[PDB]
Amino acid sequence: STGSATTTPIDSLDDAYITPVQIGTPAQTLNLDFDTGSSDLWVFSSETTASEVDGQTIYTPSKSTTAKLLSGATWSISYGDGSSSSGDVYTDTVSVGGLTVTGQAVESAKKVSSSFTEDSTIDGLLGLAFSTLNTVSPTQQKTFFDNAKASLDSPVFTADLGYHAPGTYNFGFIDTTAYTGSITYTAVSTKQGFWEWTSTGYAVGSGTFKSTSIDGIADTGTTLLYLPATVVSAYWAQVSGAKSSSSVGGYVFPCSATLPSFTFGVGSARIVIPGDYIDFGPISTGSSSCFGGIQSSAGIGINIFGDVALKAAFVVFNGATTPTLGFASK
């Protein structure tokens, strides 16, 4: 089997991407944030505290003929941005882009944090990291990809995120029309439950490439690119007037600037992030200070190749017995 779904930016900045997901019978279509940095499929639901729902589409298990309470199971997750959610669990039929999994754990939110409520465009998350991070207790549950894997033509999914445009998530096949050149594969560590890999270095603009190992995760659920402070300082030193603002919470730059590109290494290959991808716009409406898309990871404990980096590539998440990542230009 295969599946193919279009993913759409939620706003003009590509702050996140939503992908329609069919849950239950008859289908209830919710727009989920596919997140390769977490492992829970959770949704706004008929169980969500009413004051915490503001415009999201909700899953109502009682209207699904295939929904079953997973008795005793609860979940609770906290993300890197400080957001959180929790609730109970149903199993149901879940389809993405024509690929169907029966018996998928659908984690129904009873509580969501303010950042979820305030984002009307995101009806929940669909985690695509390794199932070892799934938070369901007392019986850990599998991701949609882990449940689909054995049925897929190839045990892979691909992320092809757009810059200010829709893109695609494919399951079970590699669309050889979606990228240029060849795909460079690189090793993955699953020890922290992430798609964790080691970049071979970086360049700023037309500058020379610096060979240096940068361990980090491929995380579609993170907007920005978070790298070590040395790398980030080297990048923003090339932008006149850029500075790290403790008041704003990262590097800002004059909105009049033209940003340089940033290149990262994948083995001997190179992925170029155009400068425009690094512009996240005014820090507040009407400001002439703009927020940067490359930020320090120093306060995180891990480097994160988020959407700023991934949208510059065609990315293969290879879930073979020994997982690997692949990157191609596009």
Coordinates of N, CA, C and O in Angstrom, one line a residue, residues 49-230:
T49 N -12.1 20.0 27.3 CA -12.6 21.1 28.1 C -13.2 22.2 27.2 O -12.3 22.7 26.4
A50 N -14.4 22.6 27.2 CA -15.1 23.5 26.2 C -14.3 24.8 26.1 O -14.2 25.3 25.0
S51 N -13.9 25.4 27.2 CA -13.2 26.7 27.3 C -11.8 26.6 26.6 O -11.2 27.7 26.3
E52 N -11.3 25.4 26.3 CA -10.0 25.2 25.6 C -10.2 24.9 24.1 O -9.1 24.7 23.5
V53 N -11.4 25.0 23.6 CA -11.6 24.8 22.2 C -12.0 26.1 21.6 O -13.0 26.7 22.2
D54 N -11.4 26.6 20.6 CA -11.7 27.9 19.9 C -11.5 27.8 18.4 O -10.5 28.2 17.9
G55 N -12.4 27.1 17.8 CA -12.5 27.0 16.3 C -11.9 25.8 15.7 O -12.1 25.5 14.5
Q56 N -11.3 24.9 16.5 CA -10.8 23.6 16.0 C -11.9 22.7 15.6 O -13.0 22.7 16.2
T57 N -11.7 21.8 14.7 CA -12.6 20.7 14.4 C -12.3 19.6 15.4 O -11.1 19.3 15.7
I58 N -13.3 19.0 16.0 CA -13.1 18.0 17.0 C -13.5 16.6 16.5 O -14.4 16.5 15.6
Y59 N -12.8 15.6 17.0 CA -13.2 14.2 16.9 C -14.2 13.8 17.9 O -14.0 14.1 19.1
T60 N -15.3 13.2 17.5 CA -16.4 12.7 18.4 C -16.4 11.2 18.3 O -17.0 10.7 17.4
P61 N -15.8 10.5 19.2 CA -15.7 9.0 19.1 C -17.1 8.4 19.2 O -17.3 7.4 18.5
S62 N -18.1 9.0 19.8 CA -19.4 8.4 20.0 C -20.1 8.4 18.6 O -21.1 7.7 18.5
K63 N -19.7 9.2 17.6 CA -20.2 9.2 16.3 C -19.5 8.3 15.3 O -19.9 8.2 14.1
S64 N -18.5 7.5 15.8 CA -17.7 6.6 15.0 C -18.1 5.2 15.3 O -17.9 4.8 16.5
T65 N -18.5 4.4 14.4 CA -19.0 3.0 14.6 C -17.8 2.1 14.8 O -18.0 1.0 15.3
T66 N -16.5 2.6 14.5 CA -15.3 1.8 14.7 C -14.5 2.2 15.9 O -13.5 1.6 16.2
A67 N -14.9 3.3 16.6 CA -14.2 3.7 17.8 C -14.4 2.8 18.9 O -15.5 2.3 19.2
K68 N -13.4 2.5 19.7 CA -13.4 1.7 20.9 C -12.6 2.4 22.0 O -11.4 2.7 21.7
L69 N -13.1 2.6 23.2 CA -12.3 3.1 24.3 C -11.2 2.1 24.5 O -11.4 0.9 24.6
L70 N -10.0 2.6 24.7 CA -8.8 1.8 25.1 C -8.8 1.9 26.6 O -8.3 2.9 27.2
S71 N -9.4 0.9 27.2 CA -9.8 1.0 28.7 C -8.6 1.2 29.6 O -7.7 0.4 29.5
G72 N -8.6 2.2 30.4 CA -7.6 2.5 31.4 C -6.5 3.3 30.8 O -5.6 3.7 31.6
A73 N -6.4 3.5 29.5 CA -5.2 4.2 28.9 C -5.4 5.7 29.0 O -6.4 6.3 28.8
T74 N -4.3 6.4 29.4 CA -4.2 7.8 29.5 C -2.9 8.3 28.8 O -2.0 7.5 28.6
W75 N -2.9 9.6 28.5 CA -1.7 10.1 27.9 C -1.5 11.5 28.4 O -2.4 12.2 28.8
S76 N -0.2 12.0 28.3 CA 0.1 13.4 28.7 C 1.5 13.7 28.1 O 2.4 12.9 28.3
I77 N 1.5 14.8 27.4 CA 2.7 15.2 26.7 C 3.0 16.6 26.9 O 2.1 17.5 27.0
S78 N 4.3 16.9 26.9 CA 4.9 18.3 27.0 C 5.8 18.5 25.8 O 6.7 17.6 25.6
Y79 N 5.7 19.5 25.1 CA 6.6 19.8 23.9 C 7.7 20.7 24.3 O 7.7 21.5 25.3
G80 N 8.7 20.8 23.4 CA 9.9 21.7 23.6 C 9.5 23.2 23.7 O 10.3 23.9 24.3
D81 N 8.4 23.6 23.2 CA 7.9 25.0 23.2 C 7.2 25.3 24.5 O 6.7 26.4 24.7
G82 N 7.0 24.3 25.5 CA 6.3 24.6 26.7 C 4.8 24.2 26.6 O 4.1 24.3 27.7
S83 N 4.3 23.8 25.5 CA 2.9 23.5 25.3 C 2.7 22.0 25.8 O 3.7 21.3 25.9
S84 N 1.5 21.7 26.0 CA 1.1 20.4 26.6 C -0.3 20.1 26.3 O -1.2 20.9 25.9
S85 N -0.6 18.8 26.4 CA -2.0 18.2 26.3 C -2.0 16.9 27.0 O -1.0 16.3 27.2
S86 N -3.2 16.4 27.3 CA -3.5 15.1 27.9 C -4.9 14.7 27.8 O -5.8 15.4 27.5
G87 N -5.1 13.4 28.0 CA -6.5 12.8 27.9 C -6.5 11.3 28.0 O -5.7 10.7 28.6
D88 N -7.5 10.8 27.3 CA -7.7 9.3 27.3 C -7.6 8.8 25.9 O -7.1 9.6 25.0
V89 N -7.9 7.6 25.6 CA -7.4 7.0 24.3 C -8.5 6.1 23.7 O -9.1 5.3 24.5
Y90 N -8.8 6.2 22.4 CA -9.6 5.3 21.7 C -8.8 4.6 20.6 O -7.7 5.1 20.3
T91 N -9.2 3.5 20.2 CA -8.7 3.0 18.9 C -9.7 3.2 17.8 O -10.9 3.2 18.1
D92 N -9.3 3.5 16.6 CA -10.2 3.8 15.5 C -9.4 3.6 14.2 O -8.2 3.5 14.2
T93 N -10.1 3.6 13.1 CA -9.6 3.6 11.8 C -9.1 5.0 11.4 O -9.8 6.0 11.5
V94 N -7.8 5.1 11.0 CA -7.2 6.3 10.6 C -6.6 6.2 9.2 O -5.9 5.2 8.9
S95 N -7.0 7.1 8.3 CA -6.5 7.1 6.9 C -5.8 8.4 6.6 O -6.3 9.5 7.0
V96 N -4.6 8.3 6.0 CA -3.9 9.5 5.5 C -3.6 9.3 4.0 O -2.9 8.4 3.6
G97 N -4.2 10.2 3.2 CA -3.8 10.2 1.8 C -4.2 8.9 1.1 O -3.4 8.4 0.2
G98 N -5.2 8.2 1.6 CA -5.6 6.9 1.0 C -5.0 5.7 1.7 O -5.4 4.5 1.3
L99 N -4.1 5.8 2.6 CA -3.5 4.7 3.4 C -4.2 4.5 4.7 O -4.3 5.5 5.5
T100 N -4.8 3.4 5.0 CA -5.6 3.1 6.1 C -4.9 2.2 7.1 O -4.4 1.2 6.8
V101 N -5.0 2.6 8.4 CA -4.6 1.8 9.5 C -5.8 1.5 10.4 O -6.5 2.5 10.8
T102 N -6.2 0.3 10.6 CA -7.2 -0.1 11.6 C -6.6 -0.2 13.0 O -5.4 -0.6 13.1
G103 N -7.3 0.1 14.0 CA -6.8 -0.1 15.4 C -5.8 0.9 15.8 O -5.1 0.7 16.7
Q104 N -5.7 2.1 15.2 CA -4.8 3.1 15.5 C -5.2 3.8 16.9 O -6.4 4.1 17.0
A105 N -4.2 4.0 17.8 CA -4.5 4.7 19.0 C -4.7 6.2 18.6 O -3.8 6.8 18.1
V106 N -5.9 6.7 18.9 CA -6.3 8.1 18.7 C -6.5 8.7 20.1 O -7.3 8.3 20.9
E107 N -5.6 9.5 20.5 CA -5.4 10.1 21.9 C -6.4 11.3 21.9 O -6.1 12.3 21.2
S108 N -7.4 11.2 22.7 CA -8.5 12.2 22.8 C -8.1 13.2 23.8 O -7.9 12.8 25.0
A109 N -8.0 14.5 23.5 CA -7.6 15.5 24.5 C -8.7 15.8 25.5 O -9.8 16.1 25.0
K110 N -8.4 15.7 26.7 CA -9.3 16.4 27.7 C -8.9 17.8 28.0 O -9.7 18.6 28.3
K111 N -7.6 18.0 28.0 CA -6.9 19.3 28.3 C -5.9 19.6 27.3 O -5.2 18.7 26.9
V112 N -5.9 20.9 26.9 CA -4.8 21.4 26.0 C -4.3 22.7 26.6 O -5.1 23.4 27.2
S113 N -3.0 23.0 26.4 CA -2.5 24.3 26.8 C -2.9 25.4 25.9 O -3.4 25.2 24.8
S114 N -2.7 26.6 26.4 CA -3.2 27.9 25.7 C -2.7 28.0 24.3 O -3.5 28.4 23.4
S115 N -1.5 27.6 24.0 CA -1.0 27.8 22.6 C -1.8 26.9 21.6 O -2.0 27.3 20.5
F116 N -2.2 25.7 22.1 CA -3.1 24.9 21.2 C -4.4 25.6 21.0 O -4.9 25.7 19.9
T117 N -5.1 26.0 22.1 CA -6.4 26.6 22.0 C -6.3 27.8 21.0 O -7.3 28.0 20.2
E118 N -5.3 28.6 21.1 CA -5.1 29.9 20.4 C -4.8 29.6 18.9 O -4.9 30.6 18.1
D119 N -4.5 28.4 18.5 CA -4.3 28.1 17.1 C -5.5 27.3 16.6 O -5.5 26.1 16.7
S120 N -6.4 28.0 16.0 CA -7.7 27.4 15.5 C -7.4 26.5 14.3 O -8.3 25.7 14.0
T121 N -6.3 26.6 13.6 CA -6.0 25.8 12.4 C -5.5 24.4 12.6 O -5.5 23.6 11.7
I122 N -5.0 24.1 13.8 CA -4.4 22.8 14.2 C -5.3 22.0 15.0 O -5.6 22.4 16.2
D123 N -5.9 20.9 14.5 CA -6.9 20.0 15.2 C -6.2 18.9 16.0 O -6.9 18.2 16.7
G124 N -4.9 18.9 16.0 CA -4.1 17.9 16.8 C -2.8 17.6 16.1 O -2.5 18.3 15.1
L125 N -2.1 16.6 16.6 CA -0.8 16.2 16.1 C -0.8 14.8 15.7 O -1.5 14.0 16.3
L126 N 0.0 14.5 14.7 CA 0.2 13.1 14.3 C 1.7 12.8 14.4 O 2.5 13.3 13.5
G127 N 2.2 12.1 15.4 CA 3.6 11.9 15.6 C 4.2 10.9 14.7 O 3.6 9.8 14.5
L128 N 5.4 11.1 14.3 CA 6.1 10.3 13.3 C 7.6 10.0 13.8 O 8.4 9.5 13.0
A129 N 7.9 10.3 15.1 CA 9.1 9.9 15.6 C 8.9 8.4 16.0 O 8.0 7.7 15.6
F130 N 9.9 7.8 16.8 CA 9.9 6.4 17.1 C 8.9 6.1 18.2 O 8.7 7.0 19.1
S131 N 8.2 5.0 18.2 CA 7.1 4.7 19.1 C 7.6 4.6 20.5 O 6.8 4.7 21.4
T132 N 8.9 4.4 20.8 CA 9.5 4.5 22.2 C 9.2 5.8 22.8 O 9.2 5.8 24.1
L133 N 8.8 6.9 22.1 CA 8.5 8.2 22.8 C 7.0 8.3 23.1 O 6.6 9.3 23.7
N134 N 6.1 7.3 22.6 CA 4.7 7.5 22.8 C 4.4 7.6 24.3 O 4.9 6.8 25.1
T135 N 3.5 8.4 24.7 CA 3.2 8.7 26.1 C 2.1 7.9 26.7 O 1.8 8.0 27.9
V136 N 1.4 7.0 25.9 CA 0.2 6.3 26.5 C 0.7 5.4 27.6 O 1.7 4.7 27.4
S137 N -0.1 5.4 28.7 CA 0.2 4.6 29.9 C -1.1 3.9 30.2 O -2.2 4.5 30.1
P138 N -1.1 2.6 30.6 CA 0.1 1.8 31.0 C 0.7 1.0 29.8 O 1.7 0.3 30.0
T139 N 0.0 1.1 28.7 CA 0.4 0.3 27.5 C 0.8 1.3 26.4 O -0.1 1.9 25.8
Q140 N 2.1 1.4 26.1 CA 2.6 2.3 25.1 C 2.0 1.9 23.8 O 1.9 0.7 23.5
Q141 N 1.7 2.9 22.9 CA 1.0 2.7 21.6 C 2.0 3.0 20.5 O 3.0 3.8 20.7
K142 N 1.7 2.5 19.4 CA 2.5 2.7 18.1 C 2.0 3.9 17.3 O 0.8 4.2 17.3
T143 N 3.0 4.5 16.6 CA 2.6 5.6 15.7 C 1.8 5.0 14.5 O 1.9 3.8 14.2
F144 N 1.2 6.0 13.8 CA 0.6 5.6 12.5 C 1.6 5.0 11.5 O 1.2 4.0 10.9
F145 N 2.8 5.5 11.5 CA 3.8 4.9 10.5 C 4.2 3.5 11.0 O 4.2 2.6 10.2
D146 N 4.4 3.3 12.3 CA 4.8 2.0 12.8 C 3.7 1.0 12.5 O 3.9 -0.1 12.1
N147 N 2.4 1.4 12.7 CA 1.3 0.5 12.4 C 1.2 0.2 10.9 O 0.8 -1.0 10.5
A148 N 1.4 1.2 10.0 CA 1.3 1.0 8.6 C 2.4 0.2 8.0 O 2.2 -0.3 6.9
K149 N 3.6 0.2 8.6 CA 4.9 -0.1 8.0 C 4.8 -1.4 7.2 O 5.3 -1.4 6.0
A150 N 4.3 -2.4 7.9 CA 4.4 -3.8 7.3 C 3.6 -3.9 6.0 O 3.9 -4.7 5.2
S151 N 2.5 -3.1 5.9 CA 1.6 -3.0 4.7 C 2.2 -2.2 3.6 O 1.8 -2.3 2.5
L152 N 3.1 -1.3 3.9 CA 3.6 -0.4 2.8 C 4.5 -1.1 1.8 O 5.2 -2.0 2.1
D153 N 4.5 -0.5 0.6 CA 5.3 -1.1 -0.5 C 6.8 -1.0 -0.1 O 7.6 -1.9 -0.4
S154 N 7.2 0.0 0.6 CA 8.6 0.3 1.1 C 8.4 0.9 2.5 O 7.5 1.7 2.6
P155 N 9.2 0.6 3.5 CA 9.0 1.0 4.9 C 9.5 2.4 5.1 O 10.5 2.7 5.9
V156 N 8.9 3.4 4.4 CA 9.5 4.8 4.3 C 8.3 5.8 4.3 O 7.2 5.4 3.9
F157 N 8.6 7.0 4.8 CA 7.7 8.1 4.4 C 8.6 9.2 4.1 O 9.8 9.3 4.4
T158 N 8.1 10.2 3.3 CA 8.8 11.3 2.8 C 8.1 12.6 3.2 O 6.9 12.7 3.2
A159 N 8.9 13.6 3.5 CA 8.4 15.0 3.8 C 9.0 15.9 2.7 O 10.2 16.0 2.5
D160 N 8.1 16.6 2.0 CA 8.4 17.6 1.0 C 7.6 18.8 1.3 O 6.6 19.1 0.7
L161 N 8.2 19.6 2.2 CA 7.4 20.8 2.7 C 7.7 21.9 1.8 O 8.8 22.1 1.3
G162 N 6.7 22.8 1.5 CA 6.8 23.9 0.7 C 7.2 25.2 1.4 O 6.9 25.4 2.5
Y163 N 7.9 26.1 0.7 CA 8.1 27.5 1.1 C 7.0 28.3 0.7 O 6.8 28.5 -0.5
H164 N 6.2 28.8 1.7 CA 5.0 29.6 1.4 C 4.2 28.9 0.4 O 3.5 29.6 -0.5
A165 N 4.0 27.6 0.4 CA 3.2 26.9 -0.5 C 3.0 25.5 0.0 O 3.7 25.0 0.9
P166 N 2.0 24.8 -0.5 CA 1.7 23.4 -0.1 C 2.8 22.5 -0.5 O 3.6 22.8 -1.4
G167 N 2.9 21.4 0.2 CA 3.9 20.3 -0.1 C 3.2 19.0 0.1 O 1.9 18.9 0.1
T168 N 3.9 17.9 0.3 CA 3.4 16.6 0.3 C 4.1 15.7 1.4 O 5.3 15.7 1.5
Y169 N 3.3 14.8 2.0 CA 3.8 13.7 2.8 C 3.4 12.5 2.0 O 2.2 12.2 1.8
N170 N 4.3 11.6 1.7 CA 4.1 10.3 1.1 C 4.5 9.2 2.0 O 5.5 9.3 2.7
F171 N 3.7 8.1 1.9 CA 4.0 6.9 2.7 C 4.1 5.7 1.8 O 3.3 5.5 1.0
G172 N 5.2 5.0 1.9 CA 5.4 3.7 1.2 C 6.1 3.8 0.0 O 6.3 2.8 -0.6
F173 N 6.5 5.0 -0.5 CA 7.2 5.1 -1.8 C 8.0 6.4 -1.9 O 7.6 7.4 -1.2
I174 N 8.9 6.5 -2.8 CA 9.8 7.6 -3.0 C 9.5 8.2 -4.4 O 9.7 7.4 -5.4
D175 N 8.9 9.4 -4.5 CA 8.4 10.0 -5.7 C 9.7 10.5 -6.4 O 10.2 11.6 -6.0
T176 N 10.2 9.8 -7.4 CA 11.5 10.2 -8.0 C 11.3 11.5 -8.8 O 12.3 12.0 -9.3
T177 N 10.1 12.0 -9.0 CA 9.8 13.3 -9.8 C 9.9 14.5 -8.8 O 9.9 15.6 -9.3
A178 N 10.0 14.2 -7.5 CA 9.8 15.3 -6.5 C 11.1 15.9 -6.1 O 11.2 16.9 -5.3
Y179 N 12.3 15.5 -6.6 CA 13.6 16.0 -6.2 C 14.5 16.1 -7.4 O 14.2 15.4 -8.4
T180 N 15.6 16.8 -7.3 CA 16.6 16.9 -8.3 C 17.8 16.1 -7.8 O 18.0 15.9 -6.6
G181 N 18.7 15.7 -8.8 CA 19.9 15.0 -8.4 C 19.6 13.7 -7.7 O 18.6 13.0 -8.0
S182 N 20.5 13.3 -6.8 CA 20.3 12.0 -6.0 C 20.0 12.3 -4.5 O 20.2 13.4 -4.0
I183 N 19.5 11.3 -3.9 CA 19.2 11.3 -2.4 C 20.5 10.9 -1.7 O 21.0 9.8 -2.1
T184 N 21.0 11.6 -0.8 CA 22.1 11.2 0.1 C 21.6 10.7 1.4 O 20.9 11.5 2.1
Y185 N 21.8 9.5 1.7 CA 21.4 8.8 3.0 C 22.5 9.0 4.0 O 23.7 8.9 3.7
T186 N 22.0 9.1 5.2 CA 22.9 9.3 6.4 C 22.3 8.5 7.6 O 21.1 8.3 7.7
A187 N 23.2 8.1 8.5 CA 22.9 7.3 9.6 C 22.0 8.0 10.6 O 22.1 9.2 10.8
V188 N 21.2 7.2 11.3 CA 20.2 7.7 12.3 C 20.5 6.9 13.6 O 20.7 5.7 13.6
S189 N 20.5 7.7 14.7 CA 20.5 7.1 16.0 C 19.0 7.1 16.5 O 18.5 8.3 16.5
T190 N 18.5 6.0 17.0 CA 17.2 6.0 17.6 C 17.2 6.1 19.1 O 16.2 5.9 19.8
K191 N 18.4 6.3 19.7 CA 18.6 6.2 21.2 C 17.8 7.1 22.0 O 17.4 6.8 23.1
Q192 N 17.4 8.3 21.5 CA 16.6 9.3 22.2 C 15.1 9.3 21.6 O 14.4 10.1 21.9
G193 N 14.9 8.3 20.7 CA 13.5 8.2 20.0 C 13.3 9.1 18.9 O 12.1 9.1 18.3
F194 N 14.3 9.9 18.4 CA 14.1 10.9 17.4 C 14.8 10.4 16.1 O 15.6 9.4 16.2
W195 N 14.5 11.0 15.0 CA 15.3 10.9 13.7 C 16.5 11.7 13.9 O 16.6 12.9 13.4
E196 N 17.5 11.2 14.7 CA 18.7 11.9 15.1 C 19.9 11.5 14.1 O 20.1 10.3 13.9
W197 N 20.5 12.5 13.6 CA 21.5 12.3 12.6 C 22.7 13.3 12.8 O 22.5 14.2 13.7
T198 N 23.7 13.3 12.0 CA 24.9 14.2 12.2 C 25.2 14.9 10.8 O 25.6 14.2 9.9
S199 N 24.9 16.1 10.8 CA 25.3 17.0 9.6 C 26.8 17.1 9.6 O 27.5 17.1 10.7
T200 N 27.4 17.2 8.4 CA 28.8 17.3 8.2 C 29.3 18.7 8.2 O 30.6 18.9 8.1
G201 N 28.5 19.7 8.3 CA 29.0 21.1 8.5 C 28.1 22.1 7.9 O 26.9 21.8 7.6
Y202 N 28.6 23.3 7.6 CA 27.7 24.4 7.2 C 28.5 25.4 6.4 O 29.8 25.6 6.6
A203 N 27.8 26.2 5.7 CA 28.4 27.5 5.1 C 27.3 28.6 5.3 O 26.1 28.3 5.3
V204 N 27.8 29.8 5.3 CA 27.0 31.0 5.4 C 27.1 31.7 4.1 O 28.2 32.1 3.7
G205 N 26.0 31.9 3.4 CA 26.1 32.6 2.1 C 27.0 31.9 1.1 O 27.0 30.7 1.0
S206 N 27.8 32.8 0.5 CA 28.8 32.3 -0.5 C 30.1 31.9 0.2 O 31.1 31.6 -0.5
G207 N 30.2 31.9 1.5 CA 31.4 31.6 2.3 C 31.8 30.1 2.2 O 31.1 29.2 1.6
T208 N 33.0 29.9 2.7 CA 33.6 28.5 2.6 C 32.8 27.6 3.5 O 32.4 28.0 4.6
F209 N 32.8 26.3 3.1 CA 32.1 25.3 3.9 C 33.0 24.9 5.1 O 34.2 24.6 4.9
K210 N 32.4 24.9 6.3 CA 33.1 24.5 7.5 C 32.7 23.1 7.8 O 31.6 22.8 8.1
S211 N 33.7 22.2 7.8 CA 33.5 20.8 8.1 C 33.5 20.6 9.6 O 34.5 20.9 10.3
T212 N 32.3 20.2 10.2 CA 32.2 20.1 11.6 C 30.9 19.2 11.8 O 30.0 19.4 11.1
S213 N 31.0 18.3 12.7 CA 29.9 17.4 13.0 C 28.8 18.1 13.9 O 29.1 18.6 14.9
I214 N 27.6 18.1 13.4 CA 26.5 18.7 14.1 C 25.4 17.7 14.3 O 24.6 17.4 13.3
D215 N 25.3 17.1 15.5 CA 24.2 16.1 15.8 C 22.9 16.9 16.0 O 22.9 17.8 16.7
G216 N 21.8 16.4 15.4 CA 20.5 17.0 15.6 C 19.4 16.2 15.1 O 19.7 15.0 14.6
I217 N 18.2 16.6 15.2 CA 17.0 15.8 14.8 C 16.3 16.5 13.7 O 16.2 17.7 13.5
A218 N 15.8 15.6 12.8 CA 14.9 16.1 11.7 C 13.5 16.2 12.3 O 12.9 15.1 12.6
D219 N 13.0 17.4 12.5 CA 11.7 17.6 13.3 C 10.8 18.5 12.5 O 10.8 19.7 12.5
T220 N 9.8 17.9 11.8 CA 8.8 18.6 11.0 C 7.9 19.5 11.9 O 7.2 20.4 11.4
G221 N 7.8 19.1 13.2 CA 7.0 19.8 14.2 C 7.6 21.0 14.8 O 6.9 21.7 15.6
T222 N 8.8 21.4 14.4 CA 9.5 22.6 14.9 C 9.6 23.5 13.7 O 10.0 23.1 12.6
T223 N 9.3 24.8 13.9 CA 9.3 25.8 12.8 C 10.7 26.1 12.4 O 10.9 26.2 11.1
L224 N 11.6 26.4 13.3 CA 12.9 27.0 13.0 C 14.0 26.0 13.0 O 13.9 24.8 13.3
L225 N 15.2 26.5 12.6 CA 16.4 25.7 12.6 C 17.2 26.2 13.9 O 17.6 27.4 14.0
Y226 N 17.5 25.3 14.8 CA 18.2 25.5 16.0 C 19.5 24.8 16.0 O 19.6 23.6 16.0
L227 N 20.6 25.6 16.1 CA 21.9 25.1 15.9 C 22.8 25.7 17.0 O 22.5 26.6 17.7
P228 N 24.1 25.1 17.1 CA 24.9 25.6 18.2 C 25.2 27.1 18.1 O 25.2 27.7 17.0
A229 N 25.4 27.8 19.2 CA 25.6 29.2 19.3 C 26.7 29.7 18.4 O 26.6 30.8 17.9
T230 N 27.8 28.9 18.2 CA 28.9 29.3 17.4 C 28.4 29.5 15.9 O 28.8 30.5 15.3

